[PDB]
Write an enzyme that holds these catalytic residues in place. Structure first.
Site, PDB file in Angstrom:
ATOM      1  N   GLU A 174      95.805   0.647  35.154  1.00 52.88           N
ATOM      2  CA  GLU A 174      95.204   0.925  33.820  1.00 52.88           C
ATOM      3  C   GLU A 174      96.314   1.274  32.834  1.00 52.88           C
ATOM      4  O   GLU A 174      97.017   2.260  33.034  1.00 52.88           O
ATOM      5  CB  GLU A 174      94.153   2.028  33.928  1.00 52.88           C
ATOM      6  N   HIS A 204      88.036   2.239  30.487  1.00 55.37           N
ATOM      7  CA  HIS A 204      87.692   3.455  31.272  1.00 55.37           C
ATOM      8  C   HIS A 204      86.947   4.446  30.369  1.00 55.37           C
ATOM      9  O   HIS A 204      87.451   5.566  30.166  1.00 55.37           O
ATOM     10  CB  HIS A 204      88.973   4.038  31.872  1.00 55.37           C
TER      11      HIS A 204
HETATM   12  N1  LIG Z   1      84.193   5.479  34.937  1.00 53.91           N
HETATM   13  C1  LIG Z   1      84.334   6.779  34.701  1.00 53.91           C
HETATM   14  O1  LIG Z   1      84.824   7.236  33.667  1.00 53.91           O
HETATM   15  C2  LIG Z   1      83.846   7.737  35.756  1.00 53.91           C
HETATM   16  C3  LIG Z   1      83.313   8.983  35.421  1.00 53.91           C
HETATM   17  C4  LIG Z   1      82.685   9.725  36.391  1.00 53.91           C
HETATM   18  C5  LIG Z   1      82.813   9.356  37.710  1.00 53.91           C
HETATM   19  N2  LIG Z   1      83.465   8.215  38.067  1.00 53.91           N
HETATM   20  C6  LIG Z   1      83.619   7.824  39.500  1.00 53.91           C
HETATM   21  O2  LIG Z   1      82.358   7.422  40.013  1.00 53.91           O
HETATM   22  C7  LIG Z   1      82.357   7.590  41.449  1.00 53.91           C
HETATM   23  C8  LIG Z   1      81.102   8.314  41.862  1.00 53.91           C
HETATM   24  O3  LIG Z   1      81.124   9.642  41.298  1.00 53.91           O
HETATM   25  P1  LIG Z   1      79.983  10.697  41.689  1.00 53.91           P
HETATM   26  O4  LIG Z   1      80.102  11.856  40.766  1.00 53.91           O
HETATM   27  O5  LIG Z   1      78.680   9.990  41.835  1.00 53.91           O
HETATM   28  O6  LIG Z   1      80.471  11.132  43.146  1.00 53.91           O
HETATM   29  P2  LIG Z   1      79.720  11.876  44.340  1.00 53.91           P
HETATM   30  O7  LIG Z   1      80.752  12.518  45.196  1.00 53.91           O
HETATM   31  O8  LIG Z   1      78.637  12.727  43.765  1.00 53.91           O
HETATM   32  O9  LIG Z   1      79.060  10.643  45.116  1.00 53.91           O
HETATM   33  C9  LIG Z   1      79.886   9.673  45.798  1.00 53.91           C
HETATM   34  C10 LIG Z   1      79.126   9.177  47.004  1.00 53.91           C
HETATM   35  O10 LIG Z   1      79.831   8.065  47.614  1.00 53.91           O
HETATM   36  C11 LIG Z   1      79.497   8.096  48.976  1.00 53.91           C
HETATM   37  N3  LIG Z   1      80.351   7.198  49.744  1.00 53.91           N
HETATM   38  C12 LIG Z   1      81.562   7.474  50.332  1.00 53.91           C
HETATM   39  N4  LIG Z   1      82.057   6.465  51.004  1.00 53.91           N
HETATM   40  C13 LIG Z   1      81.110   5.463  50.858  1.00 53.91           C
HETATM   41  C14 LIG Z   1      81.052   4.141  51.341  1.00 53.91           C
HETATM   42  N5  LIG Z   1      81.985   3.600  52.121  1.00 53.91           N
HETATM   43  N6  LIG Z   1      79.957   3.407  51.018  1.00 53.91           N
HETATM   44  C15 LIG Z   1      79.013   3.966  50.249  1.00 53.91           C
HETATM   45  N7  LIG Z   1      78.958   5.198  49.748  1.00 53.91           N
HETATM   46  C16 LIG Z   1      80.051   5.903  50.089  1.00 53.91           C
HETATM   47  C17 LIG Z   1      79.617   9.570  49.336  1.00 53.91           C
HETATM   48  O11 LIG Z   1      78.985   9.859  50.562  1.00 53.91           O
HETATM   49  C18 LIG Z   1      78.920  10.208  48.127  1.00 53.91           C
HETATM   50  O12 LIG Z   1      77.532  10.442  48.353  1.00 53.91           O
HETATM   51  C19 LIG Z   1      83.682   8.295  41.776  1.00 53.91           C
HETATM   52  O13 LIG Z   1      84.676   7.351  42.155  1.00 53.91           O
HETATM   53  C20 LIG Z   1      84.024   8.953  40.439  1.00 53.91           C
HETATM   54  O14 LIG Z   1      85.391   9.292  40.302  1.00 53.91           O
HETATM   55  C21 LIG Z   1      83.958   7.393  37.094  1.00 53.91           C
END
Ligand SMILES: NC(=O)c1ccc[n+]([C@@H]2O[C@H](COP(=O)([O-])OP(=O)(O)OC[C@H]3O[C@@H](n4cnc5c(N)ncnc54)[C@H](O)[C@@H]3O)[C@@H](O)[C@H]2O)c1
Ligand SMILES: NC(=O)c1ccc[n+]([C@@H]2O[C@H](COP(=O)([O-])OP(=O)(O)OC[C@H]3O[C@@H](n4cnc5c(N)ncnc54)[C@H](O)[C@@H]3O)[C@@H](O)[C@H]2O)c1
Ligand SMILES: *C[C@H]1C(=O)[C@]23[C@H](O)[C@H]1CC[C@H]2[C@@]12CO[C@]3(O)[C@@H](O)[C@@H]1C(C)(C)CC[C@@H]2O
Ligand SMILES: [Cl-]
Ligand SMILES: [Cl-]
Ligand code: NA
Lengths: 306, 306
Positions: free
Chosen positions: A261, A279
């Site tokens: 990025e 992003h």
């Molecule tokens: N684009 C953005 O600006 C932005 C902002 C917020 C969050 N995010 C990203 O979004 C993602 C999700 O965030 P969240 O708050 O929901 O996280 P969270 O921890 O609440 O949920 C993530 C889930 O993924 C599951 N997981 C792990 N390995 C897995 C696999 N192999 N297959 C399927 N599921 C699996 C975990 O068990 C968990 O339940 C993260 O990578 C976070 O950093 C991005």
């Protein structure tokens, strides 16, 4: 305990206010050089960042008084956790503040893939009227596969259920009983691929999720599957995604995030069937405000312990 | 007394099948000249069109046996209603086939205004990484004003309710009790304007709705209101909208429809805060299929009534 806190990225004023209400001194400077950052941290026990400031091993090792790094966002992408752990520095983030804003952008990306709104706007702004090119798909009755049923996955599910989408998904830690409570049927990955009209990823970046979508997974998908990555760059293999877009195995992709990025390889961004954002998943006034508060409260809680 | 029906535009084979199941004879010819169209209509009491075939005063006056013109769509832009009325020819459309596709595009436009997805895609495709420029709005807790609570208005309401939007609105024929049953609080127009973060229009084009949004209405709005018109060109006064975008009284607008299509005045389309589509509200495979079926069923229902 904490005397002084540096804010090295642009945060809501309410971050500084809560810290100063808690008896902490705050400095706020953005676009600082690595040398500049090290210079301003000599007086500071606390550092608060977004994603811009890179808290590397070199910055951690140079900052002598630094005790806590606070990230007003999810994950620890721009912080060397190993370096911080070796120095005994505590790394904190805001796992709740960004959830709704990321879920809303994901839903927007699904609608944009269905109707090619970004491409249609570009066409209109070029003075063109291209009705046939932009024939789209109705979401009602389509299947959405949700990989990761944590904070964001479950919020995407309930919103896209209102459009009459069937929501299926996979999470190795979330019970089928919990997923059922927000209308998501859990299946093994091998059963998910052939059913999906749309696939969205909401997992951390782990070895298990690096290329969670790849050539093997696209081979199992419906021809013309549409894919969203508003999670982390690399969860969708960018090479495999481009091959799927080139064959038409993938009809379109929406990417908020990239392995690099900004991305130096422009093949995906330049593809006519790819929609993208720099992003922006957490880029709302409301999310920035909530994360600013969430991290400030964690700092004040640390003061009460110390 | 429908016996033979001409299909002068490209429709799903299911249109012909339903008509022939109902005991009607069908001819199917596309891209016919106005003289050519008149020639093939001499045997036909029924004509089914999309938007390509122009059913002008000259075509109506020349077609002697023609009794019913059917449009596989919601509008009748390409049919001279006056000329048809003077001849006693019935003009039919498909008021239900396009509802969900138009509601889905409206919801997509709301999400695109909230997060500037089309502008962010354009920025990425120009080789730029502009995170700060594209600071957006979280929909949760925001007020959506819905003007017109018929087929499309109520479908937009239930979808945007899933995002935690407060849905208020106005319809002169829908009772406040009925609108409450699909979660829309009815208020007088004067009470709606100051409350709205977003306004969407789902009315017919009538004298009462020509400039339903105008300088007087924008003056009553919250500064930075966002506006969607996926209904008909002219419901939002295009002059008043441009003035509101220029002052910042309106923070952004999404337009599927224009007073002239394609629009010759490009001031709105070219505005950085305007997203647009070339009238794609009904442009899904599913809607086009359902409208083709819906018009055929209406023709067969007429046969059954005689
Ligand atoms: N684009 C953005 O600006 C932005 C902002 C917020 C969050 N995010 C990203 O979004 C993602 C999700 O965030 P969240 O708050 O929901 O996280 P969270 O921890 O609440 O949920 C993530 C889930 O993924 C599951 N997981 C792990 N390995 C897995 C696999 N192999 N297959 C399927 N599921 C699996 C975990 O068990 C968990 O339940 C993260 O990578 C976070 O950093 C991005
Ligand atoms: N963009 C597209 O491709 C597309 C496709 C489908 C429909 N449309 C248009 O969307 C609009 C709505 O379609 P629909 O099927 O929901 O229509 P509908 O007839 O089911 O509902 C329209 C409603 O508007 C109300 N209305 C009339 N005057 C009003 C006023 N002054 N203020 C507020 N409400 C008023 C009516 O009482 C009615 O309930 C129409 O103009 C239709 O042509 C556009
Ligand atoms: C191609 C159309 C068609 O012939 C249908 C539908 O409209 C659509 C697919 C399925 C057909 C029906 C339902 O309605 C039809 O018009 C009719 O031909 C069929 C009947 C016989 C009514 C029932 C079976 C099938 O579902
Ligand atoms: Cl519900
Ligand atoms: Cl009433
Ligand atoms: Na944020």
């Amino acid at each position: 305990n904490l005397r002084k806190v540096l804010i090295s990225d642009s945060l809501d004023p309410c971050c500084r206010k809560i810290l100063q209400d808690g008896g902490l001194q705050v400095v706020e400077k953005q676009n600082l050089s690595k040398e500049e950052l090290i210079a301003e941290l000599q007086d500071c026990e606390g550092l608060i960042v977004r994603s811009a400031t890179k808290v590397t091993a070199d910055v951690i090792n140079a900052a002598e008084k630094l005790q806590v790094v606070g990230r007003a966002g999810t994950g620890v992408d721009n912080v060397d956790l190993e370096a911080a752990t070796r120095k005994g520095i505590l790394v904190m983030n805001t796992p709740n503040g960004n959830s709704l804003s990321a879920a809303e952008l994901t839903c927007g990306m699904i609608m944009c893939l269905a109707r090619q709104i970004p491409q249609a706007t570009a066409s209109m702004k070029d003075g063109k009227w291209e009705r046939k090119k932009f024939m789209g798909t109705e979401l009602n009755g389509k299947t959405l596969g949700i990989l990761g049923l944590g904070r964001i996955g479950r919020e995407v599910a309930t919103r896209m259920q209102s459009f009459g989408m069937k929501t299926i998904g996979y999470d190795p830690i979330i019970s089928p009983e919990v997923s059922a409570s927000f209308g998501v049927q859990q299946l093994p990955l091998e059963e998910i691929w052939p059913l999906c009209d749309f696939i969205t990823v909401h997992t951390p970046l782990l070895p298990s999720t690096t290329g969670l979508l790849n050539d093997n997974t696209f081979a199992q998908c419906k021809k013309g599957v549409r894919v969203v990555n508003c999670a982390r760059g690399g969860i969708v293999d960018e090479g495999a995604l481009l091959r799927a877009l080139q064959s038409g195995q993938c009809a379109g992709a929406a990417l908020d995030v990239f392995t690099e990025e900004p991305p130096r390889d422009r093949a995906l961004v330049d593809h006519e069937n790819v929609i993208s954002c720099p992003h922006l998943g957490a880029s709302t006034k409301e999310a920035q405000s909530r994360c600013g508060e969430e991290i400030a409260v964690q700092f004040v809680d640390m003061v009460k312990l110390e």
